[PDB]
Amino acid sequence: DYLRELLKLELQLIKQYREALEYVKLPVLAKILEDEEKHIEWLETILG
Amino acid sequence: DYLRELLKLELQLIKQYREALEYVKLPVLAKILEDEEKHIEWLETILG
Ligand SMILES: [Mn+2]
Ligand SMILES: [Mn+2]
């Protein structure tokens, strides 16, 4: 579950990232997004 | 403040990351940590 909990925060994280991106074209914001998306696939992979 | 709010979630994120790392030697967990740490410096840089 610890792993679910992180998958949960990350998923909460991106949304807020994506919110900013509805409004501002800030490439560094889009670049964090991309890592978290990676970050979230590893979680899913290791959750099975 | 939107930027503070993200700096805030990230900071909340790592802690939970670091918690797992007190217990488990999972290199992929340590590798996320590292990105978020980057993720957090960009925030600080852009917060000024
Ligand atoms: Mn992440
Ligand atoms: Mn991050």
Tab-separated table of N, CA and C and ligand atoms in Angstrom:
chain	number	residue	atom	x	y	z
A	1	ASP	N	0.818	-1.195	0.000
A	1	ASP	CA	0.000	0.000	0.000
A	1	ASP	C	0.855	1.249	0.000
A	2	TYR	N	2.063	1.125	0.522
A	2	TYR	CA	2.884	2.312	0.555
A	2	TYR	C	3.004	2.734	-0.872
A	3	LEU	N	3.084	1.754	-1.758
A	3	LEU	CA	3.310	2.039	-3.158
A	3	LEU	C	2.060	2.620	-3.773
A	4	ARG	N	0.900	2.187	-3.300
A	4	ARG	CA	-0.335	2.777	-3.789
A	4	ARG	C	-0.386	4.230	-3.358
A	5	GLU	N	-0.057	4.477	-2.093
A	5	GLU	CA	-0.120	5.832	-1.573
A	5	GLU	C	0.697	6.828	-2.422
A	6	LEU	N	1.843	6.394	-2.952
A	6	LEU	CA	2.701	7.264	-3.777
A	6	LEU	C	2.118	7.447	-5.170
A	7	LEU	N	1.724	6.333	-5.771
A	7	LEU	CA	0.924	6.388	-6.969
A	7	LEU	C	-0.237	7.326	-6.781
A	8	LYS	N	-0.695	7.508	-5.546
A	8	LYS	CA	-1.859	8.365	-5.297
A	8	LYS	C	-1.478	9.834	-5.234
A	9	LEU	N	-0.406	10.132	-4.531
A	9	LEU	CA	0.061	11.484	-4.503
A	9	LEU	C	0.478	11.922	-5.904
A	10	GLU	N	1.166	11.067	-6.638
A	10	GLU	CA	1.648	11.474	-7.951
A	10	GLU	C	0.466	11.857	-8.809
A	11	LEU	N	-0.549	11.000	-8.765
A	11	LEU	CA	-1.742	11.193	-9.571
A	11	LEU	C	-2.422	12.483	-9.167
A	12	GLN	N	-2.345	12.817	-7.884
A	12	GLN	CA	-2.884	14.074	-7.411
A	12	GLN	C	-2.009	15.215	-7.923
A	13	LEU	N	-0.702	14.973	-7.977
A	13	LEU	CA	0.274	15.953	-8.413
A	13	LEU	C	0.052	16.399	-9.837
A	14	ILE	N	0.126	15.471	-10.776
A	14	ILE	CA	-0.058	15.824	-12.180
A	14	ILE	C	-1.256	16.721	-12.450
A	15	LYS	N	-2.348	16.530	-11.717
A	15	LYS	CA	-3.610	17.161	-12.091
A	15	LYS	C	-3.396	18.618	-11.942
A	16	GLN	N	-2.731	18.946	-10.845
A	16	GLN	CA	-2.447	20.320	-10.481
A	16	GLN	C	-1.429	20.920	-11.481
A	17	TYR	N	-0.460	20.091	-11.885
A	17	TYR	CA	0.422	20.400	-13.010
A	17	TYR	C	-0.332	20.694	-14.285
A	18	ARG	N	-1.257	19.809	-14.619
A	18	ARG	CA	-2.004	19.980	-15.833
A	18	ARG	C	-2.888	21.216	-15.691
A	19	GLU	N	-3.375	21.519	-14.488
A	19	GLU	CA	-4.181	22.729	-14.345
A	19	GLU	C	-3.444	23.979	-14.771
A	20	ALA	N	-2.164	24.029	-14.436
A	20	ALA	CA	-1.395	25.225	-14.662
A	20	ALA	C	-1.202	25.243	-16.147
A	21	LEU	N	-0.975	24.077	-16.714
A	21	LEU	CA	-0.798	24.071	-18.136
A	21	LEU	C	-2.040	24.378	-18.958
A	22	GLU	N	-3.248	24.435	-18.374
A	22	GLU	CA	-4.367	24.946	-19.186
A	22	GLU	C	-4.155	26.421	-19.515
A	23	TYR	N	-3.400	27.084	-18.643
A	23	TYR	CA	-3.259	28.527	-18.603
A	23	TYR	C	-1.924	29.097	-19.025
A	24	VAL	N	-0.843	28.413	-18.685
A	24	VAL	CA	0.471	28.993	-18.907
A	24	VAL	C	1.344	28.073	-19.707
A	25	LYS	N	1.996	28.619	-20.724
A	25	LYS	CA	2.868	27.816	-21.570
A	25	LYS	C	4.264	27.902	-20.962
A	26	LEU	N	4.498	27.150	-19.893
A	26	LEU	CA	5.779	27.151	-19.190
A	26	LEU	C	6.481	25.817	-19.376
A	27	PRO	N	7.360	25.728	-20.372
A	27	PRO	CA	8.019	24.472	-20.722
A	27	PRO	C	8.565	23.649	-19.546
A	28	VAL	N	8.998	24.281	-18.461
A	28	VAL	CA	9.585	23.583	-17.312
A	28	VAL	C	8.510	22.865	-16.523
A	29	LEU	N	7.341	23.473	-16.477
A	29	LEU	CA	6.160	22.851	-15.940
A	29	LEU	C	5.826	21.607	-16.789
A	30	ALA	N	5.853	21.735	-18.117
A	30	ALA	CA	5.561	20.587	-18.979
A	30	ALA	C	6.631	19.526	-18.819
A	31	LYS	N	7.815	19.920	-18.368
A	31	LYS	CA	8.919	18.978	-18.251
A	31	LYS	C	8.865	18.182	-16.961
A	32	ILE	N	8.366	18.800	-15.898
A	32	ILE	CA	8.074	18.071	-14.669
A	32	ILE	C	6.979	17.023	-14.950
A	33	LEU	N	5.864	17.496	-15.522
A	33	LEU	CA	4.752	16.642	-15.925
A	33	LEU	C	5.318	15.365	-16.487
A	34	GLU	N	6.194	15.513	-17.479
A	34	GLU	CA	6.732	14.350	-18.169
A	34	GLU	C	7.416	13.347	-17.241
A	35	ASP	N	8.197	13.837	-16.279
A	35	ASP	CA	8.840	12.961	-15.303
A	35	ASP	C	7.833	12.235	-14.438
A	36	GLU	N	6.874	12.967	-13.917
A	36	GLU	CA	5.873	12.359	-13.082
A	36	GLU	C	5.180	11.242	-13.872
A	37	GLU	N	4.879	11.495	-15.153
A	37	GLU	CA	4.254	10.479	-16.010
A	37	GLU	C	5.098	9.226	-16.087
A	38	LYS	N	6.402	9.407	-16.217
A	38	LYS	CA	7.345	8.314	-16.073
A	38	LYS	C	7.201	7.761	-14.668
A	39	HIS	N	7.317	8.645	-13.699
A	39	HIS	CA	7.223	8.274	-12.302
A	39	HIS	C	6.024	7.367	-12.024
A	40	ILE	N	4.956	7.553	-12.788
A	40	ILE	CA	3.688	6.877	-12.524
A	40	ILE	C	3.631	5.519	-13.237
A	41	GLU	N	4.308	5.408	-14.364
A	41	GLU	CA	4.397	4.139	-15.027
A	41	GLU	C	5.274	3.176	-14.243
A	42	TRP	N	6.342	3.656	-13.635
A	42	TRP	CA	7.179	2.742	-12.875
A	42	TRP	C	6.332	2.233	-11.710
A	43	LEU	N	5.573	3.121	-11.086
A	43	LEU	CA	4.756	2.651	-10.020
A	43	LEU	C	3.823	1.553	-10.479
A	44	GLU	N	3.163	1.755	-11.610
A	44	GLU	CA	2.201	0.773	-12.080
A	44	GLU	C	2.930	-0.504	-12.424
A	45	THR	N	4.061	-0.388	-13.077
A	45	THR	CA	4.804	-1.571	-13.399
A	45	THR	C	5.092	-2.340	-12.121
A	46	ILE	N	5.616	-1.670	-11.106
A	46	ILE	CA	5.965	-2.389	-9.888
A	46	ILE	C	4.781	-2.744	-9.018
A	47	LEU	N	3.626	-2.158	-9.292
A	47	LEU	CA	2.422	-2.639	-8.629
A	47	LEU	C	1.873	-3.887	-9.328
A	48	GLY	N	2.332	-4.159	-10.543
A	48	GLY	CA	1.979	-5.394	-11.218
A	48	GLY	C	0.778	-5.165	-12.093
B	1	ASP	N	1.210	31.813	-6.283
B	1	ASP	CA	0.921	30.826	-5.265
B	1	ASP	C	0.726	29.453	-5.873
B	2	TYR	N	0.316	29.428	-7.129
B	2	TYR	CA	0.100	28.128	-7.718
B	2	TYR	C	1.419	27.436	-7.615
B	3	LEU	N	2.485	28.203	-7.784
B	3	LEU	CA	3.812	27.627	-7.813
B	3	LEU	C	4.220	27.203	-6.424
B	4	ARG	N	3.770	27.937	-5.416
B	4	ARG	CA	4.054	27.525	-4.051
B	4	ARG	C	3.341	26.216	-3.778
B	5	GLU	N	2.075	26.143	-4.181
B	5	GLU	CA	1.292	24.946	-3.923
B	5	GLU	C	1.976	23.670	-4.456
B	6	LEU	N	2.653	23.763	-5.603
B	6	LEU	CA	3.340	22.604	-6.200
B	6	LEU	C	4.630	22.288	-5.457
B	7	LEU	N	5.414	23.330	-5.215
B	7	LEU	CA	6.525	23.216	-4.304
B	7	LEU	C	6.082	22.579	-3.016
B	8	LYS	N	4.809	22.721	-2.658
B	8	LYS	CA	4.323	22.172	-1.387
B	8	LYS	C	3.992	20.694	-1.498
B	9	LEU	N	3.313	20.322	-2.561
B	9	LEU	CA	3.046	18.933	-2.773
B	9	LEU	C	4.355	18.172	-2.961
B	10	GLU	N	5.286	18.724	-3.717
B	10	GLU	CA	6.520	17.996	-3.983
B	10	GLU	C	7.209	17.705	-2.672
B	11	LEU	N	7.272	18.740	-1.840
B	11	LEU	CA	7.948	18.644	-0.557
B	11	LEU	C	7.253	17.612	0.304
B	12	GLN	N	5.937	17.509	0.161
B	12	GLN	CA	5.190	16.492	0.871
B	12	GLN	C	5.519	15.126	0.275
B	13	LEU	N	5.702	15.089	-1.042
B	13	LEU	CA	5.995	13.872	-1.773
B	13	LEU	C	7.286	13.227	-1.332
B	14	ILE	N	8.392	13.934	-1.481
B	14	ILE	CA	9.685	13.373	-1.096
B	14	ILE	C	9.695	12.698	0.266
B	15	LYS	N	8.947	13.233	1.226
B	15	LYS	CA	9.108	12.809	2.613
B	15	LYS	C	8.686	11.390	2.656
B	16	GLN	N	7.590	11.143	1.956
B	16	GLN	CA	6.979	9.830	1.893
B	16	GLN	C	7.901	8.867	1.107
B	17	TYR	N	8.522	9.398	0.048
B	17	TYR	CA	9.617	8.720	-0.646
B	17	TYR	C	10.757	8.354	0.273
B	18	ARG	N	11.202	9.328	1.049
B	18	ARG	CA	12.308	9.090	1.932
B	18	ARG	C	11.869	8.102	3.009
B	19	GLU	N	10.601	8.127	3.420
B	19	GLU	CA	10.171	7.149	4.415
B	19	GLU	C	10.384	5.720	3.966
B	20	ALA	N	10.128	5.479	2.690
B	20	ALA	CA	10.159	4.134	2.179
B	20	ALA	C	11.619	3.806	2.142
B	21	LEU	N	12.421	4.780	1.764
B	21	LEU	CA	13.824	4.490	1.731
B	21	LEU	C	14.489	4.291	3.084
B	22	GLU	N	13.831	4.584	4.218
B	22	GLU	CA	14.452	4.165	5.487
B	22	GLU	C	14.494	2.643	5.583
B	23	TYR	N	13.557	2.014	4.878
B	23	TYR	CA	13.240	0.604	5.000
B	23	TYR	C	13.623	-0.288	3.840
B	24	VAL	N	13.494	0.218	2.624
B	24	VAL	CA	13.679	-0.642	1.467
B	24	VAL	C	14.698	-0.076	0.525
B	25	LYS	N	15.625	-0.917	0.089
B	25	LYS	CA	16.667	-0.473	-0.826
B	25	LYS	C	16.143	-0.722	-2.236
B	26	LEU	N	15.262	0.152	-2.709
B	26	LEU	CA	14.655	0.025	-4.032
B	26	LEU	C	15.146	1.136	-4.945
B	27	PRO	N	16.192	0.864	-5.721
B	27	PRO	CA	16.826	1.878	-6.561
B	27	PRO	C	15.873	2.777	-7.362
B	28	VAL	N	14.714	2.282	-7.779
B	28	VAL	CA	13.765	3.047	-8.595
B	28	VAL	C	13.069	4.097	-7.754
B	29	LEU	N	12.830	3.751	-6.504
B	29	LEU	CA	12.355	4.683	-5.517
B	29	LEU	C	13.411	5.793	-5.332
B	30	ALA	N	14.686	5.420	-5.203
B	30	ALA	CA	15.739	6.426	-5.042
B	30	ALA	C	15.860	7.265	-6.298
B	31	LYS	N	15.416	6.732	-7.429
B	31	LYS	CA	15.558	7.441	-8.693
B	31	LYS	C	14.451	8.455	-8.914
B	32	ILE	N	13.257	8.153	-8.419
B	32	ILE	CA	12.181	9.137	-8.390
B	32	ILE	C	12.597	10.313	-7.483
B	33	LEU	N	12.992	9.975	-6.249
B	33	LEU	CA	13.486	10.945	-5.277
B	33	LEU	C	14.325	11.958	-6.008
B	34	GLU	N	15.321	11.461	-6.739
B	34	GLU	CA	16.261	12.347	-7.409
B	34	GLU	C	15.595	13.346	-8.353
B	35	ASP	N	14.605	12.895	-9.124
B	35	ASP	CA	13.866	13.789	-10.011
B	35	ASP	C	13.100	14.847	-9.245
B	36	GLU	N	12.386	14.428	-8.225
B	36	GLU	CA	11.627	15.365	-7.441
B	36	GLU	C	12.578	16.434	-6.889
B	37	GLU	N	13.762	16.016	-6.420
B	37	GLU	CA	14.763	16.962	-5.909
B	37	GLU	C	15.140	17.986	-6.956
B	38	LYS	N	15.313	17.528	-8.185
B	38	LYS	CA	15.449	18.420	-9.322
B	38	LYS	C	14.175	19.238	-9.423
B	39	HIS	N	13.060	18.541	-9.471
B	39	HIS	CA	11.761	19.172	-9.587
B	39	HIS	C	11.594	20.335	-8.608
B	40	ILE	N	12.237	20.228	-7.453
B	40	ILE	CA	12.035	21.179	-6.363
B	40	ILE	C	12.998	22.368	-6.484
B	41	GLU	N	14.165	22.134	-7.054
B	41	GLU	CA	15.071	23.217	-7.307
B	41	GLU	C	14.551	24.113	-8.420
B	42	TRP	N	13.928	23.550	-9.437
B	42	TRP	CA	13.418	24.402	-10.498
B	42	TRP	C	12.327	25.275	-9.880
B	43	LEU	N	11.492	24.685	-9.037
B	43	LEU	CA	10.492	25.495	-8.430
B	43	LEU	C	11.101	26.653	-7.673
B	44	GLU	N	12.125	26.383	-6.878
B	44	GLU	CA	12.720	27.434	-6.070
B	44	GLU	C	13.356	28.455	-6.981
B	45	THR	N	14.043	27.999	-8.001
B	45	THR	CA	14.639	28.932	-8.912
B	45	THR	C	13.560	29.849	-9.462
B	46	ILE	N	12.467	29.285	-9.954
B	46	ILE	CA	11.440	30.131	-10.548
B	46	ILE	C	10.586	30.867	-9.542
B	47	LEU	N	10.666	30.482	-8.277
B	47	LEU	CA	10.037	31.307	-7.255
B	47	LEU	C	10.934	32.489	-6.876
B	48	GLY	N	12.206	32.438	-7.253
B	48	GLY	CA	13.089	33.574	-7.067
B	48	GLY	C	13.824	33.431	-5.763
C	1	MN	MN	6.821	12.113	-9.337
C	2	MN	MN	8.072	16.099	-8.787
